Every structure is written in structure tokens, then in C-alpha cells.
């Protein structure tokens, strides 16, 4: 009894499965409901939350009712389409919401999706009662995220940043698009019934994000994922800042083509460290937090900056287990089965007594949460760690992640803009070996 086998790729101990003569094949999804008037950052919340949930391994998809509308109604003319007295467009808009819900059902019940973010105004109790009915009948959980903001400066900024550039306003100039959008918001104000956790919405699971995250009303958080979302929303901010990501300067193991270890900077690596200090100085940042791993090469690179820095064990390079300090040639010759398994499944593959890219994500989640809280940050890390962090910021899949290009002596400058990061690459003109290996 208790006979187990270790799975070759992930290295997971499973019961030996001696399937009989005729082998037989043999928790609840969530609908996240966005609530609020237009230009309240609902799409911003939807997209950022989906990016985070997918990166941590929770399959998530956004269903934006406006995109179903742009598909059903070819060209957008004006706010007149959104008028409450527009009988025809009101029918079309309802059909679009129902078509999005149909796709929500298919995603969660038939495609292995775990979270569906229903991105619409959902400003009336009637619409929300209909979404609740849809969730109850399909055995889906419902979690409401309402964004409430009365600041006209914030509303005008959102229109200027991401609304005027919408495909709806292609033939319009900035002034007419802004004016049309203000009229469009006014169409929703009369029927808008905010969430009432005090009386009406007392039994609903919800978060009210008030005044661009200054205040929060949290009601009946049922589970782990809702609690995580709430914690995430409370850590993110919309303040302007820059994230600089780079690897340690070239090390002695890099020169020998050896993986892992705790080797020091080569002469070129030390030159990069000096070049990085000059680069950092030229950026003229009021305050800058510097984060390193606990491995020597990243600390030596930070030492050249003459700035305070913090060492994180979570930033340490992927653990290669038995393959640590070996070259890839020595891995292929000593462990050919292991080498081929990794090449076939680079994300899920776990090194013996070591890690996978999947393990890295789990380790890096507190790093991501702290990066969100912070402003200007410089992260000096390692190739696999950098690919993982970059996949979060650039919304790259688990399959793409182990192959992202993160060259040595190159700074990745990340600027948060619209619904994602602008990425600028800055090579600091110091030669190094190449550690990138394609599939």
C-alpha cells in the first residue's frame, strides 16, 4: 500500500495509477461585476486585476459590453445612442450585455475559466438583479466592484487619457470627444443606483473603491480570491512612477556558461555596475528604492550605486537543484532525460530538488505586491526572476514567460500608461556573454 511515483516534469508524488482494463476519465467560478458611471476606472481595474490573477495562475477574462456594442453597431456617432429615450439602442445594448453573459457562461462552465470580469456600468439594481439571477442559476459566485468618484478633475483626466483615444472617437477632435463623453455620462446619472451594503445590498459580496482608492467599503468577503482582490486593490495606486528592472552585471559563472551558484562580478560586470550608477544619476529621481537578491552579483552591482538597498531572498535566481553550477552541455550529458523534459515544458518543469518558473511566480508574488505599493524602484535581479516579473508587467502568458529576452547590461524602464506598461530598453554599452536560449 501507499505506492507513489514522481511525475517526470513537475516532480509531484502521485499514487501509481494502474488503470483497469477499461480506463475511465471521471471550486465554484466567480463573476466579478464592475459597477459605476463611465470614466470611473472600471476598465482600468478590470484589466489590471485580470493581469494579476492570470499571472498568479487563476484563469481570468474580461467581458466588456462596449466591445460587443462596437461589434453589433459598426460606426459610433454620438451620446444620442446612450439616451434613455433611445428605444432601439436600449434593446441593442441589452442584447450586447446578454451576449456577453452567454460568453461568461461558456468561459466558466466549458473553457476552464475561473474568473469572468463583467465590465459594464451595471448602474441599476434591475441589471444587477439579472446578473445575480444568471450567477445563481449557473452556480457561479458573484463579487461586485464599484468605483465611486465625484472629483471632476479625475473624470476629465480619464476622458483625456484613455476615452478620447477610444475607437468611438476616431473621426473626432479632443474637444468634441470630451464634450460628447460628458453628455454620455449624464445619460447614466438619472437611473444610477449605487451599491447599498447598509440595506439593499447587505447580503452581496462587494468592494466600494471610493475617491480613487482613498477609502473602501468591504462587505461579506466569502473566500480566498475575493480577499486577495481586496488586498491587491488596497496596494495598487495611480501615482506617477518608474520601475527599472535589470540583471546583476556579468558574473564569473556567466563567463563559464554555468547556471546558478553565487559567483561574483567579472571585470565587465563591474564596468556595467559603474555604468548603471551613471545611468541612475542621469535619471534625476527624487527618491529611488533599490532592491537586490541575496546573491553576491546583484549586491556588488547595487554597491556601485552608493544608494541604500534592500536584499530580498525572494529575488534569488531559480534553484536548479542537482544541476546547480553546471554548464548546459554538462546537463545534457549527465541528465539527458531532464534536459529534454525542460526543453519540452520550460514553465512547469521542476529541476530535481529545485524549482520551476511556476514556483518562481509563487515566490515573487510578495515582490509584485510591494512593487505595486512603491513608486520609483530599481530591481537588480537574475534572468529567470526578471522574465517572471516582466511577464507580470507586460501581461505575458506562462508559455511565453521562460523565453522573454532579458539581456545582461540592459535596463528595462517601465512607465505605467493607459491600461498597461510602456517598456523602454537601455543598453549601458558594456560587453557581456549572451545567456539567452530560444525554444
Ligand X SMILES: O=P(O)(O)OC[C@H]1O[C@](O)(CO)[C@@H](O)[C@@H]1O
Q: What's the DSSP call for residue 169?
A: G
Q: Which of 149, 320, 364, 367 binds ligand X (CB under 6 A)?
A: 320
Q: Catalytic residue numbers? A: 119, 149, 248, 317
Q: Which of 128, 184, 271, 382 binds ligand X (CB under 6 A)?
A: 382
Q: Which of 179, 262, 375, 400 binds a copy of itself (CB under 8 A)?
A: 262
- 3-class secondary structure, 427: strand
Please indicate if the annotation marks 37 as binding a ligand. yes
Does 220 count as an annotated binding residue? no
Minimal distance, residue 243 CB to ligand X, in Å: 20
Please name every residue paired with 61 in a beta bridge, in sequence order, or none if there are none.
116
Q: Tell me phi and psi for residue 3, to 5 degrees.
A: -75, 115
Give, in degrees to the nearest 5, the angle at Cα 367 between 365 and 372. 95
Residue 411 interacts with ligand X (CB under 6 A)?
no
Q: 45 touches which of ligand X, a copy of itself, ligand 87T, none (CB within 5 to 8 A by kind)?
A: ligand 87T
Q: Per the structure block, which three cell numbers stand in for 373?
A: 505599493
**Which residue stretch of 67-75, 128-136, 187-195, 233-241 sits at the interface with ligand 87T (rule: CB under 6 A)?**
233-241
State how far the Cα of 50 lies from the Cα of 32, in Å rounded to an integer: 10
Nearest to 180 by CA among 163, 158, 162, 157: 163
- Contacted entry of a copy of itself, ligand 87T, ligand X, none for residue 402, CB cut-off 5 to 8 Å set by kind: ligand X
Binding to a copy of itself by CB under 8 A, coded x per residue (else -) over 399-418, reads --------------------
Neighbours of 439 (CB within 10 A): 8
Q: For residues 206 and 35, what is the distance between their CA atoms, to the nearest angstrom?
A: 10
- According to CB under 6 A, which residues from 254 to 293 bind ligand X? 259-260
Three-state DSSP state, 320 = coil
Count of alpha carbons within 13 Å of 144, Cβ hemisphere only?
A: 31
Closest distance of CB 163 from ligand 87T, Å: 10
Q: At what angle do helices 65-72 and 87-110 cross, to 10 degrees?
A: 120
Q: Identify whether the C-beta of residue 413 lies closer than 8 Å to the C-beta of residue 434.
A: no
The residues that touch a copy of itself, with contacts defined as CB under 8 A, are 1-2, 4, 6, 11-13, 15, 197, 214-221, 223-224, 227, 230-231, 234-235, 262, 264-265, 270, 273, 294-296, 299-300, 303-304, 311, 313-314, 324, 353, 359, 362, 370, 373
The residues that touch ligand 87T, with contacts defined as CB under 6 A, are 40-41, 44-45, 147, 149, 154, 158, 161, 209, 212-213, 233-234, 236-238
Amino acid at each position: 500500500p501507499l505506492e507513489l511515483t514522481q511525475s517526470r516534469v513537475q516532480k509531484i508524488w502521485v499514487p501509481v495509477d494502474h488503470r483497469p482494463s477499461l480506463p475511465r476519465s471521471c471550486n465554484s467560478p466567480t463573476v466579478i461585476v464592475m459597477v459605476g458611471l463611465p470614466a470611473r476606472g472600471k476598465t482600468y481595474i478590470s484589466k489590471k486585476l485580470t493581469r494579476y490573477l492570470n499571472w498568479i495562475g487563476v484563469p481570468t477574462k474580461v467581458f466588456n459590453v462596449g466591445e460587443y456594442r462596437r461589434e453589433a453597431v459598426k460606426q459610433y456617432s454620438s451620446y444620442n445612442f446612450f439616451r434613455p429615450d433611445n428605444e432601439e439602442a436600449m434593446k441593442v445594448r441589452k442584447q450586447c450585455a446578454l451576449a456577453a453573459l452567454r460568453d461568461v457562461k461558456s468561459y466558466l462552465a466549458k473553457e476552464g475559466g475561473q474568473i469572468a470580469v463583467f465590465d459594464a456600468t451595471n448602474t441599476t439594481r434591475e441589471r444587477r438583479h439579472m446578473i445575480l439571477h444568471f450567477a445563481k442559476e449557473n452556480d457561479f459566485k458573484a463579487f461586485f466592484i464599484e468605483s465611486v468618484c465625484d472629483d471632476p478633475t479625475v473624470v476629465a483626466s480619464n476622458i483625456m487619457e484613455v476615452k478620447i483615444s477610444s475607437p468611438d472617437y476616431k473621426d473626432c477632435n479632443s474637444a468634441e470627444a470630451m464634450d460628447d463623453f460628458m453628455k454620455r455620462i449624464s445619460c447614466y446619472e438619472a437611473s444610477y443606483q449605487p451599491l447599498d451594503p447598509d440595506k439593499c445590498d447587505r447580503d452581496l459580496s462587494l468592494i466600494k473603491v471610493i475617491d480613487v482608492g482613498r477609502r473602501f467599503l468591504v462587505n461579506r468577503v466569502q473566500d480566498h480570491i475575493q480577499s486577495r482582490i481586496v488586498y491587491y486593490l488596497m496596494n495598487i495606486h495611480v501615482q506617477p512612477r518608474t520601475i527599472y528592472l535589470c540583471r546583476h552585471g556579468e558574473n564569473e559563472h556567466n563567463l563559464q556558461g554555468r547556471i546558478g551558484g553565487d559567483s561574483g562580478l567579472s571585470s565587465r560586470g563591474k564596468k556595467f555596475a559603474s555604468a548603471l550608477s551613471k545611468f541612475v544619476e542621469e535619471q534625476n529621481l527624487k527618491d529611488l528604492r533599490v532592491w537586490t537578491s541575496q546573491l553576491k552579483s546583484t549586491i556588488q552591482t547595487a554597491e556601485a550605486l552608493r544608494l541604500p538597498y534592500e536584499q530580498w531572498k525572494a529575488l534569488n535566481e531559480i534553484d536548479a537543484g542537482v544541476c546547480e553550477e553546471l554548464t548546459y552541455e554538462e546537463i545534457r550529458d549527465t541528465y539527458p532525460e531532464e534536459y529534454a523534459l525542460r526543453e519540452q515544458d520550460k514553465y512547469y518543469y521542476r529541476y530535481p530538488t529545485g524549482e520551476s518558473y511556476q514556483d518562481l511566480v509563487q515566490r515573487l508574488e510578495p515582490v509584485i505586491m510591494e512593487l505595486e505599493r512603491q513608486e520609483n524602484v530599481l530591481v537588480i535581479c537574475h534572468q529567470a526572476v526578471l522574465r517572471c516579473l516582466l511577464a507580470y508587467f507586460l501581461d505575458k502568458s506562462a508559455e511565453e514567460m521562460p523565453y522573454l529576452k532579458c539581456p545582461l547590461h540592459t535596463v528595462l524602464k517601465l512607465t505605467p500608461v493607459a491600461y498597461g506598461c510602456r517598456v523602454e530598453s537601455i543598453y549601458l554599452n558594456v560587453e557581456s556573454v549572451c545567456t539567452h536560449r530560444e525554444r
